[PDB]
């Protein structure tokens, strides 16, 4: 694969040219529209003169290859001229003649057409490969400056607040890509003109005047495609911003897998999501709509402009036209079709590249300059005004310089500036205003390289937590090891499935903040140069009966060391030899003392204080030909006449404009000076003419079909996964991370929404062309078969090359630019997290490096694009000067050659169509086929006689249920239990009961989840038997909670989904409970109140579901309350003795007193599994029963 090849340049453009050339000319533009400061508002003005890399080669070398293309045809009217045979009654001598009669030859014009086609392929691609390798370095330029005006500057915003992230959703990847393809594009707007004027002279100069009018209509038929441009882009923009809000939807939707798979809200959560999905393919058909209809534009224009023509032929009077006349006009008309495409996208791009460049110096000229403005002490300010940078007045009268190595601390919860006051000593605020000294020497940025910090707004780098802390020094495993085990992330630990080099941080493994405050603080601490700077780092994140034991940590680590470390927190369950601290409500720190010497100045502040205290050989060798039976599978299933219609449709338009030609070639065939009359100008008019209509009526037809047959395919597609996918088997959907399934929820539906269409009919349509171009030119010469057989043969075998090829360095590509779009994703998201950690200019370090290192991999990419065209043009090449050879030799008729070279020159152009749509539709297909493959599988059947049974609510004998008597190894891959533990529990039994780690776990699946060979035999569970309860109806009457109760959604405002008009949701059956009551009994959001993915965001009266609403099932389950205040379970617990009254009976699962602590029926268990039923708990004590338990009793 060879994924870094080599840099080969990075000297050249990659990064130290680019910004030599960008800055220099932002010097320019700043010098010289300072004579003219507002005068004329320009923006970039001058970003003509930004490079001194010229452009003008590429419109030199591109307005050559048009004309010398241009030319071509003209030479195929020579080369059809002399088809009338003037001969036995005069042959001149000419002796040693040279320019005499050199040209009307006809094996000299086609050595010439062979000279010129060969030099135009060259030049034009050579021009704008050398314009692309230009452009890749304007991206990167562009990039550097973005990026050099982000980072030194962007640090001390406040008016950024608005928009966290507007620059990595800008600049990320719509406003770069855009200039560069733009940069790319800008010769076709620079010079079609000139073609598009040339080929009218020339079509002027050899049409004379019956074509003229039947000429000037493709000009305007381009503004058509330019016209439908606009429309398909507002049904874009509506089918994204559908598909945005059903990708929501379905990620709220999947985010509960464990929660639905067995309550009452299975299938019925997703209800409303489907019908999202057919709204939302409402608006996709619109989009398609356009998109057919501009096949049409592009499929039938040309015919009907030239009929046109023959229309005015009857304008011209003449006898006929003569087939060295009009042939040649066609082909013109076929050449100049070509650069209008080009024009209406340029239409677009550039008002894209406009509307970008203008956001980009809107963006790199807001307050940039202000927001950086330029014994290891700083410290020495008498300022009349130092402002909360925009914010004025906000420290006023500020003066104070402060001995290193003391532990600072104005605790303070309101008005305590702590984080303007933190941010304004160290410079890295803008608080400069006045005059501001320093010490006398630095052991000029305010005297601050020594600084450390660490978060206060929690923040986690996007890799392995390792290197989130390894922080450019050294690192081995001593001191690293000793920072680490002094607070050690022991969860952490066994969690990361490869330790701190695991997946950590925003799109990895998840932590939670008090470990995120850990991790910043241990950050702290392995630095070096430590002078720390912390601004309230342990207000939030507190260490329970840590943070002393996290500050003896750093007490042996720096306070026995020689390193100034301080703390800024208000907390005081660290204020042991809290000794500084500070008045300053809006004011500086005008005090400061020992741990007592502050009660000497006696301020009522002291005293106030205490009151309220895998192999290659299985990946590349089964590569060739990947998606063959996946396409036969996509095809044919969903297919509403996808081959019994649309193929012969498709057939028929090309055979029909095939034959419109052969028609054309039969109206002027011989017929051009025998007959003058008056009666021989209409004859053919019903032989050619008449077909002219089907050149643009059948083609119309197919311009639908295809498209058509997608749109039915993409609905059956997604509704087929969520057919397939409405319920599963737990054991995959608890194995396989969720994020794959997402993605091949999402981005493979779009992919077969979007683009495997237009990839299909761009495909078939130049592979049926390029086919009935060969058949012709081998009718119009027999030995043609032969002769074009062999060398394209040979081109399949390389055209096989890069059906791999090019992939894998595509495939390079698609991995290419994960990585450099993070790093303008993290410097910017931490606006202020990277202020001033003294590490600033180190960023670009890496940002240089990544910037190549992806760029090289676009540039061979588009190398190799390069290549395959080249190679195509040359083959295009051969075969027409073999097909004019062999028409020239055989000398049938003007007719019979103008047909076989005017293909021929129509060929030449197909076959990079053809090779690249074979491979836009390989890997279209190929990503197809990564979730064609589960499309509909089902894993869990439902194969049952079980009897109609009413089973109303009822509790048959308090839930008695005793199945388990030394259970067997599970099985069914569904995570078995591995042990055996005899069941045998209470039926009266209210309280819960402790248990162990051993089979607590396995116990609390087991209160509903399925499982084959787990715990068979005999069995007195619930008067029906449990294999044979109905998979239809009885699982919706089960119950159970989560081990954290998470309810994402609203999950009360539509809690009301299945029967249940109760209409006692708002204070009868939940305000009762008193954990509802919050949110119902007293609160003005209402029975219709939603949370966006919060179960405990918003909702912290009830994390909990609400018990008794749900009976206003019968079996209650218990969970590990991880997070739950100890008060509010108590009252939870008298709710569930509330639902007892109805009940009686509840099994819970835990390992901790906590929860296991208000026992009134237990059991005495063994090993993990209750043994004997027995209510005491000391007679657990004297047995086997709670003596775990009783580590803690
Ligand atoms: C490789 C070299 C092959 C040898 C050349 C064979 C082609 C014949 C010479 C070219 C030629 O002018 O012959 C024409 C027909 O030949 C033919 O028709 C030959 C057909 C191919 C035979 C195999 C006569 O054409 P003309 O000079 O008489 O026409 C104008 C009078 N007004
Ligand atoms: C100058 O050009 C044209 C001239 C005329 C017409 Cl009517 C269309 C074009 C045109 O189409 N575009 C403008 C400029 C342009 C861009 C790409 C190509 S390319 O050779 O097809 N290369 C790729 O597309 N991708 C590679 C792979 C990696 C990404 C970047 C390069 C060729 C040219
Ligand atoms: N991003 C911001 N938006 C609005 N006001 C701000 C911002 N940053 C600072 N301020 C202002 O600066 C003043 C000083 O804030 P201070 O440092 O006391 O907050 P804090 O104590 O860190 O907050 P917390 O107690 O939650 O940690 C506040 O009155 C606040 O209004």
Redesign the pocket.
Same mark, same amino acid.
């Given at each position: 694969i060879d994924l870094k090849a080599i840099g080969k340049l990075p000297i050249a453009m990659r990064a130290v040219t680019n910004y030599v050339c960008l800055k220099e000319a932002y010097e320019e533009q700043k010098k010289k529209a300072a004579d003219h400061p507002n005068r004329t508002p320009s923006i970039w003005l001058a970003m003509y003169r930004a490079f001194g890399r010229p452009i003008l080669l590429s419109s030199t070398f591109?307005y050559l290859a048009d004309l010398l293309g241009f030319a071509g045809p003209l030479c195929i009217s020579g080369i059809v001229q002399r088809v009338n045979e003037p001969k036995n009654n005069t042959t001149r001598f000419s002796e040693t003649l040279s320019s005499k009669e050199f040209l009307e030859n006809a094996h000299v014009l086609a050595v010439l057409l062979f000279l010129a086609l060969i030099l135009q392929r060259t030049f034009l691609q050579a021009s $704008?490969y050398v314009?692309?390798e230009t452009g890749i370095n304007l991206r990167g330029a562009l990039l550097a400056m973005i990026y050099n005006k982000i980072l030194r500057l962007s640090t001390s915003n406040l008016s950024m607040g608005e928009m966290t992230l507007g620059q990595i959703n800008n600049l990320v990847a719509i406003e770069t890509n855009q200039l560069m393809?733009f940069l *790319? !594009?800008c010769?076709?707007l620079w010079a079609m003109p000139v073609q598009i004027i040339m080929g009218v002279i020339l079509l002027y100069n050899l049409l004379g005047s019956s074509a003229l009018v039947g000429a000037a209509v493709i000009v305007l038929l381009a503004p058509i495609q330019y016209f439908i441009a606009t429309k398909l882009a507002e049904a874009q923009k509506s089918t994204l911003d559908y598909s945005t809000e059903r990708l929501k939807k379905t990620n709220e939707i999947l985010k509960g897998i464990k929660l639905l798979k067995l309550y009452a809200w299975e299938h019925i959560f997703c209800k409303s999501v489907e019908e999202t999905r057919m709204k939302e393919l409402s608006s996709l058909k619109t989009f398609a709509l356009y998109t057919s209809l501009s096949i049409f534009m592009n499929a039938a224009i040309p015919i009907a402009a030239v009929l046109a023509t023959f229309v005015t032929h009857a304008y011209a009077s003449g006898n006929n036209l003569k087939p060295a006349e009009a042939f040649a006009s066609l082909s013109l008309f076929h050449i100049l079709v070509?650069?209008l *495409? !080009?024009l209406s996208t340029v239409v677009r791009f550039a008002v894209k590249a406009i509307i970008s460049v203008q956001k980009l110096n809107e963006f790199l000229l807001s307050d940039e300059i202000g927001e950086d403005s330029w014994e290891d002490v700083a410290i020495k300010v008498t300022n009349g005004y130092f402002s909360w940078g925009s914010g004025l007045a906000t420290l006023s009268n500020i003066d104070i310089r402060i001995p290193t190595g003391q532990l600072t601390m104005i605790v303070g919860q309101v008005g305590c500036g702590k984080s303007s006051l933190l941010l304004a000593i160290l410079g890295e605020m803008q608080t400069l205003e006045g005059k501001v000294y320093w010490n006398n020497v630095n052991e000029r940025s305010r005297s601050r390289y020594s600084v450390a910090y660490a978060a206060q707004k929690p923040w986690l780098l996007n890799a392995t937590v390792e290197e989130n802390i390894t922080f450019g020094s050294s690192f081995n495993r001593q001191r690293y090891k000793a920072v680490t085990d002094a607070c050690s992330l022991q969860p952490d630990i066994d969690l990361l499935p490869f330790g701190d080099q695991t997946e950590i941080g925003e799109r990895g493994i998840n932590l939670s903040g008090g470990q995120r405050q850990r991790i910043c603080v241990a950050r702290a601490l392995y630095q070096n140069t430590n002078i720390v700077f912390l601004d309230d780092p342990f207000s939030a994140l507190d260490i329970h009966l840590s943070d002393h034991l996290m500050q003896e940590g750093i007490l042996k680590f720096l306070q026995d060391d020689k390193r100034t470390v301080v703390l800024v927190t208000h907390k005081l369950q660290y204020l042991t030899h809290a000794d500084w601290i500070i008045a300053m409500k809006d004011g500086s720190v005008l005090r400061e003392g020992t741990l007592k010497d502050i009660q000497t100045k006696d301020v009522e502040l002291y005293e106030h204080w205490k009151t309220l205290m895998d192999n290659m050989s299985t990946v590349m060798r089964l590569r060739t030909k990947m998606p063959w039976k996946t396409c036969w599978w996509y095809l044919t299933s969903g297919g509403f006449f996808l081959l019994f219609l649309m193929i012969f449709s498709k057939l028929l338009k090309h055979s029909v404009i095939v034959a419109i030609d052969y028609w054309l070639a039969t109206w002027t065939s011989e017929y051009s000076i025998n007959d003058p009359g008056k009666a021989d100008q209409t004859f053919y008019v019903a032989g050619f003419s008449i077909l002219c209509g089907a050149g643009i009526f059948l083609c119309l037809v197919t311009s639908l079909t295809v498209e058509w047959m997608g749109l039915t395919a993409a609905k059956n597609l997604h509704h087929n996964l969520l057919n397939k996918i409405i319920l599963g088997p737990i054991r995959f959907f608890d194995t396989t991370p969720l994020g794959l399934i997402l993605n091949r929820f999402s981005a493979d539906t779009n992919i077969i929404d979007q683009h495997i269409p237009p990839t299909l009919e761009s495909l078939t349509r130049s592979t049926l062309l390029c086919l009935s171009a060969i058949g012709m030119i081998s009718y119009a010469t027999p030995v043609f078969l032969i002769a074009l057989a062999p060398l394209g043969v040979a081109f399949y075998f390389i055209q096989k090359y890069f059906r791999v090829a090019s992939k894998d360095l595509q495939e390079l590509?698609d991995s290419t630019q994960l990585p450099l779009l993070c790093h303008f994703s993290e410097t910017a998201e931490g606006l202020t997290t990277i202020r001033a950690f003294r590490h600033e200019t180190r960023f670009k370090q890496r940002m240089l490096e990544l910037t190549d290192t992806n760029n090289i991999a $676009?540039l061979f !990419?588009?190398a190799?694009?390069?290549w395959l065209?080249v190679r195509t043009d040359y083959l295009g090449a051969c075969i027409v000067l073999t097909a004019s050879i062999a028409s020239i030799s055989g000398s049938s008729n003007s007719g019979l050659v103008g047909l076989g070279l005017l293909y021929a020159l129509t060929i030449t152009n197909y076959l990079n169509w053809v090779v690249?749509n074979l491979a836009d539709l390989e890997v279209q297909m190929g990503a197809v086929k990564k979730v064609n493959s589960f499309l509909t599988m089902e894993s869990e059947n439902y194969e049952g006689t079980m009897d109609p049974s009413q089973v109303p609510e009822h509790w048959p004998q308090e839930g008695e249920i005793k199945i388990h008597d030394l259970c067997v190894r599970y099985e069914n891959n569904l995570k078995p239990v591995l042990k055996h533990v005899k069941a045998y529990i209470k039926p009266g039994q209210k309280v819960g009961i402790c248990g162990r780690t051993g089979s607590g776990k396995s116990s609390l699946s087991l209160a509903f989840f399925r499982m084959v060979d787990i715990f068979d035999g005999k069995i007195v569970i619930d008067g029906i038997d449990i294999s044979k309860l109905p998979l239809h109806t009885l699982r919706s009457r089960l119950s159970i909670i989560l081990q954290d109760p998470i309810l994402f959604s609203g999950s009360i405002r539509f809690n009301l989904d299945p029967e249940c008009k109760c209409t006692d949701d708002r204070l009868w059956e939940a305000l009762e409970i008193a954990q509802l009551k919050n949110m119902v009994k007293s609160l003005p959001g209402g029975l219709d109140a939603t949370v966006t993915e919060g179960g405990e965001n918003f909702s912290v009266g009830q994390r909990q579901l609400f018990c008794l609403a749900r009976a206003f099932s019968s079996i209650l389950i218990m969970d590990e309350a991880t997070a739950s205040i100890d008060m509010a379970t108590e009252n939870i617990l008298q709710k569930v003795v509330m639902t007892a009254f109805a009940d009686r009976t509840v099994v819970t699962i835990a390992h901790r007193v906590h929860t296991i602590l208000t026992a009134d029926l237990v059991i005495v268990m063994k090993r993990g599994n209750i043994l004997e039923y027995d209510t005491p708990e000391s007679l657990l004590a004297q047995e086997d029963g709670v003596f775990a338990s009783f580590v803690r009793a």
């Open positions: 591109r $704008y314009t692309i393809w *790319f !594009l010769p076709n070509t650069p *495409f !080009l590509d $676009y !990419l588009s190799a694009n390069r065209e690249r």
